[PDB]
Structure formats: C-alpha cells, structure tokens
Amino acid sequence: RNRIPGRQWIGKHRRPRPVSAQAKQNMIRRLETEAENQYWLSR
C-alpha cells in the first residue's frame, strides 16, 4: 500500500531508512581510532 516510487535508493524520492545507534557507535569508534592515528603522526 505504501509504494516507493522508482527504485528504493537512487531516485529523487528514496527510502527514508534512518541511522541506528549501532551505526553511530561504529562511526564514533572509527573517529577515535583516526584521532589516535593523527596524534601519533604529529611528532
């Protein structure tokens, strides 16, 4: 009943899939690792 026009992920109207707490935590962990890397690459 709730059709998605066109394809799900390419068109102007896409699927409104949200961002999860797991995704946020994974990105935060990656950011922490990169911050440590750029600290070690300083001196």
Told to check if 12 binds other proteins by CB under 8 A, we report no
Told to check if 1 binds other proteins by CB under 8 A, we report yes
Provide the minimum distance between the beta carbon of 18 and other proteins in the complex, in angstroms, as a whole number: 9
Alpha carbons within 13 angstroms on the beta-carbon side of residue 26 total 5
Mask of contacts with other proteins, 14-33, x by CB under 8 A?
-xxx----------------
Taking the C-alpha atoms of residue 39 and residue 19, their distance in angstroms, rounded to an integer, is: 29
Residue 13 is classified by DSSP as S
Give the binding site for other proteins (CB under 8 A).
1-2, 4, 15-17
